[PDB]
Amino acid sequence: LSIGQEMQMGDYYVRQLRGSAPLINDPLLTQYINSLGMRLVSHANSVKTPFHFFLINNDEINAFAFFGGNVVLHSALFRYSDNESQLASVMAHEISHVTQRHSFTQQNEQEADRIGIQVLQRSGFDPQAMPTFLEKLLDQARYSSRPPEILLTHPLPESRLADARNRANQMRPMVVQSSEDFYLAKARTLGMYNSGRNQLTSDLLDEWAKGNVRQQRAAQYGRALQAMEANKYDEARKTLQPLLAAEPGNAWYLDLATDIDLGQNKANEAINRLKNARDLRTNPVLQLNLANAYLQGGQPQEAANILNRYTFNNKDDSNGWDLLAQAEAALNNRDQELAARAEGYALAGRLDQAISLLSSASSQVKLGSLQQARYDARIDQLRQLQERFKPY
Ligand SMILES: [Zn+2]
């Protein structure tokens, strides 16, 4: 099959994936993972396609890829990764399966490790994280009643660990510090998307709290997040206070301060804080938070002003379309609401429903208007997309 045929099949399956409950659509987590992924991709050879990285809520460690550079990572990866370089080693491994066009054979696994460790190193991560991560997987398997799921897909015989140790040993020592974002992402993942063995335990928080400064702050953030989720909003504000004071332009802290404020009907305080943020105009996380606060504060037009632009510039972001729908609903702009929901459905592969909704929007809009022309042309595009997905 061609590269264009690979893109098409990939788009079909990305859409089916987005229609599934386990997909994590958190703005902070999505932005972190794709920023990390793009860093690795920028240092890889034989990249012939865009890459996209997806995070699914699943407490079994695994990672896989499918057509068109689409890499899926289970959230349990954050539980297993002690540092950012270890998380990156798994992502680099996956990228290498893709770039080499490859469960997998012994030879494919070896190649993905060898290519992946070079990408790791070129991207400024510690090569030793790769064998260290694998040794951890084997150590868990050695005394559990069953192996980690990822080993079913990516077999890990001893020879593979030995080869990886050797490659890392041959490269120069490169001790590296995890970004604060790694620890905050880990805290958020295990704390907000907890499930089964994915939990933000007191033991992890206490270990961090006596770690380096980045770990200390992520623990405190973790405590604030958990207070927020247990309806302890005063405690959450108080725990967050020193974090926000030390880094008033940190998007993780601004995001959480917004949710704390909204939870206590302080929409105006939250709006004002976000309007003063320096990176408001360029950081999609801050834009969505502001839109959400405007909605909660009963200013749906201000929300729509943000979200029309946001959805235009972030068309594959299902959060944008959902909030746009809510804003337009609250304005009783019902054709625009229907159209926003249609795009939500189209991203999840539910093309019939998308077309139905757009057809309603078109029918109750002025005949021969510019708006009606826009809806009818979008219906055209979705029908045609439906035809090419027919074979599947
Ligand atoms: Zn593999």
Numbering used by the authors: 44 to 145, 195 to 484
Could you share sentences copied from the article?
Correct folding of the Lpt system component LptD is regulated by a periplasmic metalloprotease, BepA. Among the LptD quality control proteases, BepA is different in that it also has chaperone activities and influences the insertion of other OMPs into the outer membrane, and its deletion renders cells sensitive to multiple antibiotics. The primary sequence of BepA indicates that this protein is a member of the M48 family of zinc metalloproteases, of which there are four in E. coli. In addition to the N-terminal M48 protease domain, BepA has a C-terminal tetratricopeptide repeat (TPR) domain.
The structure revealed the TPR domain, consisting of 12 α-helices forming 4 TPR motifs and four non-TPR helices, in tight association with the M48 zinc-metallopeptidase domain. This forms a nautilus-like fold with the TPR subdomain cupping the metallopeptidase domain. Helices 8 and 9 contribute a tight turn at the end of the TPR domain, allowing the M48 metallopeptidase domain to be cupped by the pocket formed from TPR motifs 2 and 3. Interaction of the protease domain with the TPR pocket creates a larger negatively charged pocket, which is also noted in the structure presented by Shahrizal et al.. The protease domain of BepA consists of the active site α-helix H4 containing the HEXXH motif, and an active-site plug formed by a loop between helices H6 and H7, residues S246 to P249. The active-site zinc ion is coordinated by H136 and H140 within the HEXXH motif, E201 contributed by helix H5, and H246 on a loop that forms the small α-helical active-site plug. Coordination of the zinc ion by H246 acts as the fourth ligand, therefore suggesting that a rearrangement of the active-site plug should be required for proteolytic activity. We did not observe any density corresponding to positions L146 to I194, and considering that this section is in close proximity to the active site, we expect that it may form a dynamic regulatory region. The importance of residue H246 for BepA function, and the conformation of the active-site plug observed in our crystal structure, suggests that the solved crystal structure may represent a proteolytically inactive form of the protein.
